Amino acid sequence: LEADGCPYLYAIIHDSTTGTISGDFNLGVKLVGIKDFCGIGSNPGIDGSRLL
Amino acid sequence: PTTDVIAKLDWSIVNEKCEPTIYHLADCQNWLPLNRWMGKLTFPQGVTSEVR
Amino acid sequence: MEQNLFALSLDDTSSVRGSLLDTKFAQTRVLLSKAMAGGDVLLDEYLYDVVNGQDFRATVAFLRTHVITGKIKVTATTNISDNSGCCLMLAINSGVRGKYSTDVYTICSQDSMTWNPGCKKNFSFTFNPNPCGDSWSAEMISRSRVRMTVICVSGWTLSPTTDVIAKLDWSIVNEKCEPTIYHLADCQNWLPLNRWMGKLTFPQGVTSEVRRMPLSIGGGAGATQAFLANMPNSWISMWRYFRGELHFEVTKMSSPYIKATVTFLIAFGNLSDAFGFYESFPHRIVQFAEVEEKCTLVFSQQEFVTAWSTQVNPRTTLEADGCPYLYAIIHDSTTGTISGDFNLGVKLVGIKDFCGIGSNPGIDGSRLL
Amino acid sequence: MEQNLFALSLDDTSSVRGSLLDTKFAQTRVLLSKAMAGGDVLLDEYLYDVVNGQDFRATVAFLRTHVITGKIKVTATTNISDNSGCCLMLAINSGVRGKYSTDVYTICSQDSMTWNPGCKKNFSFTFNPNPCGDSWSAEMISRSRVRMTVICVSGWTLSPTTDVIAKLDWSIVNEKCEPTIYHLADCQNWLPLNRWMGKLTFPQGVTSEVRRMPLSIGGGAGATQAFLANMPNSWISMWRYFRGELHFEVTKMSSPYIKATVTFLIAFGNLSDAFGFYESFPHRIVQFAEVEEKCTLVFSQQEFVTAWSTQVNPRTTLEADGCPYLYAIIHDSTTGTISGDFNLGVKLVGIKDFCGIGSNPGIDGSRLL
Predict the structure, then answer these.
(1) Which residues contact A23 (CB under 8 A, 6 or more apart)?
(2) Domain count, chain D
(3) In Å, how far is C10's CA from the nearest CA of chain D?
(4) Terminal Cα-to-Cα distance of chain D (whole angstroms)
(5) How close, in Å, is residue B18 to chain A by CA atoms?
(6) Long-range contacts of range A19-22, CB-CB < 8 Å, 24 or more positions apart?
(7) Which residue in chain A is spatially nearest to C83 when comparing CA positions?
(8) Domain housing D108
(9) Which CATH number do you get for residue D180?
């Protein structure tokens, strides 16, 4: 993490999660698409990917 | 729920037109649909501070 | 290359302004225990201290601008499931002295914001920390000791499973600052009072409840062999008799699961709780939808035939009190599939077309709020 | 009361701007010992670190704005009595690698500001830390390792009685960022080089001094069994032969008390120091007033009959060097009622109507600067 020079989408809790019922607050997040996409250069590739 | 639940799916053919969703290798595209799942954020109830 | 440094824009004497992002100077965390109770002081400290370990975009500007011209805006964030609720209040007062009272009554006269997290998921308001003028500054509010107190006016009807946290956001906005100066003119068209009338608590049940709030509001709120007062209440006490169009704000402080229909009217102290014909008087009927929390009652001059005493002798019995009362009555019954009382907050916001009559020599003490 | 927080201006994505007061993000203190010498590195560190313990109006904004669009402006403040002087240089380079050279030659190619505190009492310049584009950001210059080095290019002619301090002020200004990209076009109308030609030192005396700087600038500055080069100098070396209108900047690096009249001209390596008729060639005569420190020489295309070699074999004797030289000659004599040499700094700023001819296979090494 300290060496990752690319940006991250951050999700932060502004106050606190609550409820008069037990349960976690679960959010689903999906990158629908990119507008004005720009691909640069050919990727030779890297095997594998960090955990989702 | 106090019981098992049932969802009813209805399949019909509608009069909207069919359209292709073809991917190509243009460096610049104005809309690259990805639908790439970023993850399921789970925040536990509590006065704690969470960052994803 | 070489420049005339005297000419540069280093002496920029302007107030802070910009987007809300650039205009924010501090954030505060207030902890609401899962068992807070009402009276509970959640955070009480000088306004200035709110800016302490802060490192937001306008923090330095807030501290180094000599004359700030905009208002302070506070935004509170917190929310609970729809089967619970409570009532919080953020208040600002120009100062404190001694072992001061932090009761709702005492703290809500100057600038307050009061909401129910079960009905609203955020709440904001703007204020001018310098009531005499149209500008202030960090150094000024610091040295002059402006206080910021947050209290639980009414606790959770049903406790959240965990302690809860409210996040306060402090920003400077571009609204203009305006004084709120009080003067001795017998007739004024708007006398803001923000005088707390009380917390009505109605137990769930088929029983009949009647609440009587006296309009002879002189003195203050009663306390044990003492009384509490604030500048606005003390000010109206200068007058012997008074009259005007009264404006009240009713807040639903209980969870939205507790339901009741209350009817408000003006009548005299001598009607009995069993009087069966309260609705033969002109009245209003209040019911709150799940998400609703506030209501405004306006009693016009046509509801009062003459002026009444600002204050009545404390030992004045109900049967002998000749001044009008605001009555809160339960139209049907309080209910809920959850245990809890139906709690309402009532505040006399101000009087329109106020009329003060004669000098009040004064009476020591006040009936119980 | 309750608001749609998603709608507020919290996603304000704009660059920092405002008065110089609101637009300042850091200040730096550089210490000039009373015995600094020239070569002396006064402060050398990553640009980003300059923003460390800072608490000015734009510090947070500088760090939290994702895309900054304006230029950085540095202002230096310091000044000495008129009988002393020296020459300082603030330089910016996109990176460093290894046990790098911090010689004037090596550091002044990208963005530099160079002055004499005895002539100027402050000096400022603006720069774009991202030469490929028109925007940058704190995170970018941090991760990409942009360097900021301040050196003494020439020491005090006469020492101040105490150590001196220069105060650097860093602000973001509203000028637009622009790339400074190099390409391989044989003809370009402006090839910025900022190639340091050398420090001319003329001793006080009735003697005759001649300085010869070679225009066959390929390779770099000579060093002990090594050479130093920088991107612009390396770039022009790609060409076998070259030609163009040369633009030079001459800086008076000595105290204003040391006076001399130098004459600049273009001639070949084989004239002797004793040649008595240098002024039979087209030339310019330079004299600096007390407060003047810079001069600009422009040698037009009419001073060169053909193109010359970008680089000549290192072992090429003066008598055999067939390429032109910039000559600096003392017209009268160097004097002063104080001891000190007359020191001039000379830099080839760029070439107008540059013309590169053929590919240079290369020669290892370069004559001494």
Answers:
(1) B45
(2) 1
(3) 5
(4) 73
(5) 20
(6) A19/B45, A19/C80, A19/C81, A19/C160, A19/C161, A20/C80, A20/C81, A20/C83, A20/C84, A20/C158, A20/C159, A20/C160, A20/C161, A21/C81, A21/C161, A22/B45, A22/C161
(7) A20
(8) 1-369
(9) 2.60.120.20
